[PDB]
Design an enzyme around this catalytic site. Structure first.
Site, PDB file in Angstrom:
ATOM      1  N   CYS A 159     -14.669  18.243 -22.465  1.00 31.24           N
ATOM      2  CA  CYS A 159     -13.488  18.300 -23.426  1.00 31.24           C
ATOM      3  C   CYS A 159     -12.345  18.426 -22.613  1.00 31.24           C
ATOM      4  O   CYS A 159     -12.483  18.899 -21.146  1.00 31.24           O
ATOM      5  CB  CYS A 159     -13.976  19.575 -24.315  1.00 31.24           C
ATOM      6  SG  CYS A 159     -15.096  18.986 -25.630  1.00 31.24           S
ATOM      7  N   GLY A 195     -15.665  24.510 -15.414  1.00 29.17           N
ATOM      8  CA  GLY A 195     -15.499  23.213 -15.766  1.00 29.17           C
ATOM      9  C   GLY A 195     -16.670  23.206 -16.945  1.00 29.17           C
ATOM     10  O   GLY A 195     -17.261  24.206 -17.408  1.00 29.17           O
TER      11      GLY A 195
END
Length: 210
Positions: A170, A77
């Site tokens: 993102c 992540g």
């Protein structure tokens, strides 16, 4: 046939990380059972494998000036936030090569916890973590070294959700973030959320909690 649960309560990120690594070493060595650490952290932002400076809305210095700690880590992540009211779980388990399966099991456990509160949650086909509609209830980001996992999940129980606004993840995602408190309109006792998590892990993994 068993897993060990340790409730560390509220612990600073850095020392808790050092503890993760020590626990991990013992599990790798076969000298400790698969261990689920349950805890909370003081306000902290972590930046994982896919994270960059664009994931921070303000400069790094702003965060430390405004009560966050900030760390670069090797979990999956990009950016995430942990803080009081968020139940952080670090399953340090001998998963071997099957990491995707392990992630799905963590997801399933969290979906069970939500169902226990009358909340319908799902991993989603497309977004990491566990979601309730368009909002993320639980972040998930693990690392695996020597066939044993570390890092884990972050279930929003009574989290200050406003603290997520200063970070900018993102990639593909829903619209927002949520918590058991927000969904239910009241705070949920952390001790209870921990118990429900333990029961869910026991069920999903087929292991007895000690």
């Amino acid at each position: 046939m068993e897993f060990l649960v340790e409730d560390l309560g509220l612990v600073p990120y850095g020392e808790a990380w050092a503890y993760q690594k020590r626990v991990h070493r013992e599990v790798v060595a076969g000298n400790r059972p698969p261990t689920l650490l349950l805890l909370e952290h003081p306000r902290v932002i972590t930046l994982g494998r896919k994270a960059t400076g664009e994931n921070l809305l303000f400069p790094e210095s702003w965060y430390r000036e405004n009560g966050f700690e900030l760390y670069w880590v090797e979990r999956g992540g990009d950016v995430t936030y942990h803080g009081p009211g968020q139940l952080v779980g670090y399953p340090i388990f001998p998963v071997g090569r099957e990491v995707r399966r392990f992630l799905r099991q963590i997801e399933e456990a969290i979906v069970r916890v939500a169902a226990g509160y009358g909340i319908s949650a799902y991993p989603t086909p497309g977004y990491a973590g566990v979601w309730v509609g368009e909002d993320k209830l639980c972040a998930i980001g693990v690392a695996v070294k020597e066939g044993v996992s570390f890092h884990g999940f972050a279930l929003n129980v009574n989290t200050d959700l406003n603290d997520f606004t200063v970070i900018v993840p993102c990639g593909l995602k829903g619209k927002g973030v949520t918590s058991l408190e927000k969904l239910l309109g009241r705070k949920v006792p952390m001790e209870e959320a921990k118990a429900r998590v333990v029961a869910a892990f026991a069920e999903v993994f087929g292991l007895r909690p000690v």
